[PDB]
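Input structure tokens:
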């Protein structure tokens, strides 16, 4: 009878999924972020909060009465600064895709070369930028990631984050600590304490049980980032299990017993349980397809493909020059020649070549030290093309299928469940 709520705060709106213990969906829904008042110093944060309340309201009351645990994900490196005593958000959030170049040299002056913080969009660059604006009483401020802040709205215990959200500020999930080069700086006093994703923080606040009818013993758990929640939704849990996201671009994630980080290729690892999620991202993918054909042309041409026969066409499908993974060449040219007169042959060549690139990506992760890929689940638009699925299975020489669930909010609900089970 106990249910488990996960929310996903994405780039333009929030979503929620409520599951039972067996992962069956009892309720789900979405809301776009409302506008905020021009004068609101909170900016987008005020909207996010509104969305939180809206989503909670959207859950059927009979479903809310059964919800035993809550987790949620948010966007990576979306950074808020609060006064520790009042809880006041001291400025507009630093959004996931917002950069603080002004802080990057200082960060490079304390962090290891090619550490993942050494990027203008990193949480740490944002922290250092804010710090250096010398706000009065800044030493009484605290940093929260988007997810941490929304969760804190729910449980009332200030300053807790997770292994995943905290990565871009410099937290090391392997030693479960912030490194001395970070702790040696005064803004380190703003850093949140860090737990594993999907672990209990505290009971849901009485305000929410009173207003929405959640049971008194409902708990609130740490979250994760939306990318990782989305991966979790697939329920790939063993090393060698992989999820390929086939969308506008191509991105892969591979579960591994061994941590892998390599700046040459932009390869980075997050911690999950006792494992490492190793990610890599290519500029190839569906964008060039839809650039070349209509969606109607795409499915109609797809129906004419024999996926069990390989294309002789060697393409590197790109819209413009440049690749970082699985080839580190910022000048890498698109290759779409020769283009056969048959659009079916052309399409087959593109799909097959993207499969080649995907395979090469998994091989590179393996060569960098990851557990070798054994099976590939598929997310993104590309997943609904079964001809492409069969092509990929043949070219990769591995079993390939659709992931069953891919929504971040579904993965967040799995974290809520994990937290409840652990807490029990």
């Amino acid at each position: 009878e106990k249910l488990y709520l996960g929310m996903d705060f994405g780039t333009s709106g929030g979503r929620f999924t409520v599951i039972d213990e067996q992962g069956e969906i009892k309720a789900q829904g979405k809301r776009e972020y409302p506008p905020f008042m021009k004068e609101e110093s909170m900016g987008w944060a005020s909207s996010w909060k509104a969305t939180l309340f809206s989503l909670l309201e959207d859950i059927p009351v009979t479903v809310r009465s059964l919800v035993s645990s809550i987790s949620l994900d948010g966007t990576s490196a979306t950074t808020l600064i609060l006064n520790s005593e009042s809880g006041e958000v001291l400025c507009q959030p630093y959004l996931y895709n917002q950069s603080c170049p002004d802080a990057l040299p200082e960060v490079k002056s304390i962090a290891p070369a090619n550490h993942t913080v050494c990027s203008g969009t990193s949480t740490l660059c944002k922290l250092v930028s804010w710090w250096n604006t010398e706000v009065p009483n800044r030493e009484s401020a605290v940093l929260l990631h988007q997810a941490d802040w929304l969760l804190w709205l729910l449980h009332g215990r200030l300053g807790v984050s997770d292994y995943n959200n905290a990565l871009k500020v410099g937290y090391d999930p392997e030693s479960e600590s912030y490194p001395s080069w970070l702790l040696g700086q005064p803004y380190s006093q703003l850093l949140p304490k860090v737990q594993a994703p999907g672990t209990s923080i505290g009971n849901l606040k009485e305000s929410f049980t009173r207003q929405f009818g959640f049971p008194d013993d409902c708990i609130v758990c740490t979250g994760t980032t939306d990318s990782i929640a989305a991966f979790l939704a697939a329920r790939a849990t063993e090393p060698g299990k992989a999820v390929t996201s086939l969308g506008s671009t191509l991105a892969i994630k591979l579960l591994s017993t061994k941590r892998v980080d390599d700046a040459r290729y932009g390869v980075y690892s997050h911690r999950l349980d006792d494992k490492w999620l190793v990610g890599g991202a290519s500029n190839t993918g569906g964008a060039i397809l839809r650039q070349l054909f209509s969606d109607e042309q795409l499915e109609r041409l797809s129906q004419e493909i024999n996926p069990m026969v390989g294309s002789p066409l060697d393409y590197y499908p790109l819209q413009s020059s440049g690749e970082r993974f699985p080839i580190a060449d910022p000048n890498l040219a698109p290759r779409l020649l020769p283009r056969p007169e048959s659009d079916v042959e052309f399409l087959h060549g593109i799909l097959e070549s993207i499969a080649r690139i995907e395979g090469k990506g998994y091989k590179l992760l393996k060569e960098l030290g990851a557990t070798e890929a054994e099976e590939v689940l598929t997310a993104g638009g590309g997943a609904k093309n079964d001809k492409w699925i069969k092509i990929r299975q043949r070219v990769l020489g591995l079993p390939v299928k659709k992931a069953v669930h891919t929504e971040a909010s579904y993965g967040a609900s799995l974290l809520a469940l994990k937290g409840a089970k652990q807490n029990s």
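Residues 236-424 form one domain. Residues 343-367 form the longest helix (25 residues).
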